Amino acid sequence: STGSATTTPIDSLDDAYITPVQIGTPAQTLNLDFDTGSSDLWVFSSETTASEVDGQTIYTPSKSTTAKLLSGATWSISYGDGSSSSGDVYTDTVSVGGLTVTGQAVESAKKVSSSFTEDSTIDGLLGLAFSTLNTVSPTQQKTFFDNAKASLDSPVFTADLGYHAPGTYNFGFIDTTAYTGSITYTAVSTKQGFWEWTSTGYAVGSGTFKSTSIDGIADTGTTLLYLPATVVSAYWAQVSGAKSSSSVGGYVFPCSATLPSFTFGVGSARIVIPGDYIDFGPISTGSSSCFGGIQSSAGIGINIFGDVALKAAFVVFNGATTPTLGFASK
């Protein structure tokens, strides 16, 4: 089997991407944030504290003839950005782009943090990291991909995120029309539960490539590119007037600037992030100070190849017995 679904930016900055997901019988379609940095499929629901729901579409398990309460199971998650959610668990039928999993754990939120409430466009998350990170207790549950894998034509999914435009998540096949050149595959460590890999270096603009190992995670659920302070300083030094602002929470730059590209290495291959992908617009409405899309990972504890990096590539998440990651230009 295979599946193919369009993923759409939630706003004009590509702050996140939403993908429609069918849950239950009859189908209830919710728009979920596919997150290769976490491993829970959780949704706003009829059980979510009413004051914490503001415009989201909810899953109502009592209206699904295939929903079953997973007795005694609870979940609770905290994300790198400080947001969180928790609740109980149903199993139900879940379909993405024509690919169907029966008995998928659907984690129903009883509580969500303010950041989730305040974002009316995201109805929940669909985790695509390794199932070892799943938070369901006392019996850990499998991700949608893990459940689907054996049925797929090939045990893979691909992320093809757009810049200021829709893109695609495919399951079970590689669309050879969706990228240019070849896909370069690179080793993955699953030791921390992430799609963790080592970039071979970087360049800023038309500058020389610096060969250096950068361990980080391919994370579709993180907006920006978080890299070591040395790398980030070298990038922003090429933008007149750019500075790190403790008050704003990262590098800012004059909105009048033209940003240089940023290249990262995948083995001997190179992925080029155009400068415009690194512009996250005014820090507040009407400001001429703009927020940068490349930020320091210092104090995160891990480097994160988030959407800024991934959307410059066609990315293969290869869930073979020994997982790997593939990157192609597009």
**292-322 b/e (C-beta count within 10 Å ≥ 16 → b):** bbbbbbeeeeebbbbbbbbbbbbbbbbbeee
Which residue, 123, 120, 124, 122, is CA-closest to 55? 120
Q: Set out the domains of the chain in order of their start, with CATH numbers.
A: 5-174 (2.40.70.10), 175-330 (2.40.70.10)
Report strand pairing: 279-282 vs 289-292. Answer: antiparallel
Where does the chain have alpha helices with state H?
114-117, 144-148, 229-236, 307-310
Which method was it determined by? X-ray
Sheet holding 289-292, edge to edge: 243-245, 250-254, 289-292, 279-282
DSSP 13-25: T---EEEEEEETT
Residues labelled catalytic: 35, 199
3-state secondary structure 279-307: EEEECCCCCCEEEECEEECCCCCCEEECH
The sign one gets for the Cα dihedral 141, 142, 147, 148 is positive
On the 0-12 / 13-18 / 19+ scale of CB atoms within 10 A, 15 is middle
Sequence-distant (≥ 6) Cβ neighbours of residue 246 within 8 angstroms: none
Angle at 22 between CA 71 and CA 67, to 5 degrees: 25
CA 243 to chain centre: 27
Which residue, 102, 126, 107, is CA-closest to 44? 107
Omega cis (within 30) before 260? no
Q: What is the resolution of this structure in A?
A: 1.2
CA distances from 122 to 55, 115, 169, 177 (A): 9, 10, 17, 30
Which residue, 42, 41, 101, 104, is CA-closest to 67? 104
> Whole-angstrom Cα distance, residue 87 to residue 73?
9
Omega cis (within 30) before 61? no
Residue type, 92: D
Angle at 87 between CA 85 and CA 93, to 5 degrees: 105
**How do the residues of the chain divide into helix, strand and coil, expressed in percent and rounded to 5?**
10, 45, 45
Contact status, residue 207 vs residue 200, Cβ threshold 8 Å: no
Cβ neighbours of 132 (radius 10 Å): 13
Backbone angles phi, psi at 145, to 5 degrees: -65, -45
Contact status, residue 197 vs residue 218, Cβ threshold 8 Å: yes
Cβ neighbours of 82 (radius 10 Å): 9
DSSP 175-191: -TTSSSS-PEEEE-B-T
> Whole-angstrom Cα distance, residue 323 to residue 154?
12
Which residue, 313, 254, 319, is CA-closest to 282? 254
Which DSSP category does 208 fall into?
A: P
Which DSSP category does 143 fall into?
A: -
| R_g of the chain computed on alpha carbons | 20
Contact status, residue 70 vs residue 105, Cβ threshold 8 Å: yes
